């Protein structure tokens, strides 16, 4: 297999599809760059363990993800070559343009790509300009505008310039924020600078919404990989582009499913690494940001905790408070004292009820 390319192709799809180092769902058990494991998590982890050759517990290194990716590329190429509608075009193409074709197969499958009869013919004919214009007129171009533009540029030029130039733009932007003491991260000063450039306070709800969209691990920490992967997945190559994405993020949060996801993410982001629970003062500070205008009893809840709890908040309790806020009547008359709520919430209702 060492004789068969594959270096630029891994980085090309890492940018376009994304690299996940933990087992996820594609809406099917997946890992790496879209690597399907099975059609049970026990069975999914078993397949991953057998493929890697160690007890991974569903977590892998980038090198392991690369090994899996190379197998998927090899399978993709075998499939393209068996396809009578794809083989002629693939055969005629140079190495860089073959990588752009494999990119399409990875996104929409063989049948999806075979549907582009007119564009594929133009490619076979080496009519780059005509093909590039024709591909930009499809739903593919509208569904994934950033990825599609990059793939079309690969077909138009036969170079890696769309990927090379995005990485340049992102590395130059990163340099403005990186820690002088540690090049591989954005420190305290950098995070403040990033928020200043966005014209936002770092403790604001807008910045918390941004952290959620970036899947950031921890408050006051921001790694280079979080910055790079975040900006690419969001289709942003500048602060101005990210700024213009904020209204869309706000709208998403009006849907309860997305709000629940953001609410639960807040707990994980706010907590200290090495600790399983969230310190009370910190939990109250983030609750004031995320439950502002959603919970009638928020202030009385804060007073109750500061006076009667005075300890850490577990994840389950954090998660259940959103359900409590949604269902609770203004007079608390519908509260079920024997209806599975955490003891802390039972204690709060008992404390709050005399105060109305
Ligand atoms: C760490 C520190 C000195 C501190 O004051 N912590 C408590 C307050 N937290 C914040 O101010 C954080 C700062 C940020 N962290 C990150 C991490 C990644 C990003 C990228 C761009 C996605 C951005 C930021 S800003 N801010 C937040 O958590 C957003 C609300 C704490 C904030 C809440 C009120 C009490 C003080």
Q: What is the resolution of this structure in A?
A: 2.1
Q: Is the CB of 283 under 6 A from ligand 1?
A: no
Which of 202, 206, 222, 241 has most ligand 1 atoms within 8 Å of CB, for mutation? Answer: 202
For tokens 């007890």, the residue is 55
From the options 1.20.140.10, 3.90.1150.10, 1.20.1600.10, 1.10.530.40, give the CATH code of 7-162.
1.10.530.40
H-helix segments, 178-314: 188-197, 205-213, 224-233, 239-252, 256-270, 280-290, 298-304
Which of 177, 199, 207, 273 has most ligand 1 atoms within 8 Å of CB, for mutation? Answer: 207
Q: Coil, helix or strand for 19?
A: coil
- Residue 7 and residue 198: Cα distance in Å, rounded? 35
- Residue 193 and residue 53: Cα distance in Å, rounded? 44
CB under 8 Å, gap of 24 or more: what pairs does 252-255 form? 253/209
H-helix segments, the chain: 7-16, 41-52, 62-82, 87-92, 95-114, 117-124, 128-135, 139-143, 145-157, 161-175, 188-197, 205-213, 224-233, 239-252, 256-270, 280-290, 298-304, 315-327, 343-352
- Residue 92 and residue 289: Cα distance in Å, rounded? 57
Distances in Å between the alpha carbon of 65 and those of 23, 31, 62, 73? 11, 8, 5, 12
For tokens 């594609």, the residue is 26
Strands in 35-36's sheet, in edge-to-edge order, are 20-25, 29-32, 35-36
> Which residue's C-alpha comes closest to atom 3 of ligand 1?
220
Q: Partners of 25 in the beta sheet?
A: 29
Measured CA angle at 60 (ends 59, 64), to 5 deg: 160
Q: Is 26 a catalytic residue?
A: yes
CB under 8 Å, gap of 24 or more: what pairs does 230-234 form? 231/170, 231/173, 232/15, 232/18, 232/166, 232/170, 233/18
Q: Coil, helix or strand for 210?
A: helix
Q: Partners of 20 in the beta sheet?
A: 32
Determine the distance separating the centroid of ligand 1 and the alpha carbon of 143, expressed in angstroms.
33
Q: Coil, helix or strand for 130?
A: helix
- Residue 297 and residue 279: Cα distance in Å, rounded? 20
Q: Is the CB of 116 under 6 A from ligand 1?
A: no
For residue 301, which of 286, 315, 264, 275 has the smallest C-alpha distance?
Answer: 286
Distance of alpha carbon 276 from its chain centroid, rounded?
Answer: 23
- Residue 71 and residue 106: Cα distance in Å, rounded? 13
The token pair that represents 35 in the structure block: 């690597």
For tokens 């899947």, the residue is 215
Please state whether 35 falls in left (phi above 0), alpha (psi between -120 and 50) or beta.
Answer: beta
- Residue 62 and residue 54: Cα distance in Å, rounded? 15
| DSSP 8-state assignment for residue 44 | H
């Amino acid at each position: 297999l060492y004789f068969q390319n594959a270096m630029n192709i891994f980085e090309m799809l890492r940018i376009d599809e994304g690299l996940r180092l933990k087992i996820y769902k594609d809406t099917y058990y997946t890992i790496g760059i879209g690597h399907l494991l099975t059609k049970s998590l026990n069975a999914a982890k078993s397949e991953l363990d057998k493929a890697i050759g160690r007890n991974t517990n569903g977590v892998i290194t980038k090198d392991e993800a690369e090994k899996l990716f190379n197998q998927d590329v090899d399978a993709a190429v075998r499939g393209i070559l068996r396809n009578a509608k794809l083989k002629p075009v693939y055969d005629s193409l140079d190495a860089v343009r073959r990588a752009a074709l494999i990119n399409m197969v990875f996104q929409m499958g063989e049948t999806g790509v075979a549907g582009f009869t007119n564009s594929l013919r133009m490619l076979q004919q080496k009519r780059w300009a005509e093909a590039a214009v024709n591909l930009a007129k499809s739903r593919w171009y509208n569904q994934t505008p950033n990825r599609t533009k990059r793939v079309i540029t690969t077909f138009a030029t036969g170079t890696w310039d769309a990927y090379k130039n995005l990485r340049k733009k992102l590395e130059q932007l990163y340099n403005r924020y990186k820690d002088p003491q540690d090049e591989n991260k954005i420190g305290i000063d950098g995070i403040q600078q990033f928020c200043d450039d966005l014209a936002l306070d770092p403790a604001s709800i807008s910045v918390l919404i941004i952290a959620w969209k970036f899947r950031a691990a921890t408050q006051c920490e921001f790694s280079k990989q979080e910055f790079m992967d975040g900006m690419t997945e969001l289709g942003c190559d500048s602060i101005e582009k990210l700024k213009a994405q904020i209204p869309k993020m706000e709208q998403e949060l009006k849907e309860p499913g997305r709000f629940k996801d953001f609410y639960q993410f807040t707990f994980n982001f706010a907590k200290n690494p090495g600790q399983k629970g969230l310190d009370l003062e910190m939990a109250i500070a983030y609750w004031n940001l995320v439950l502002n205008g959603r919970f009638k009893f928020l202030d009385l809840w804060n007073k109750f905790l500061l006076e009667h709890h005075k300890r850490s908040i577990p994840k389950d309790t954090w998660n259940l408070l959103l359900d409590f806020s949604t269902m609770i009547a203004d007079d608390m008359s519908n509260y079920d004292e024997e209806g599975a709520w955490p003891v802390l919430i039972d204690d709060f209702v008992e404390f709050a009820r005399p105060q109305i």
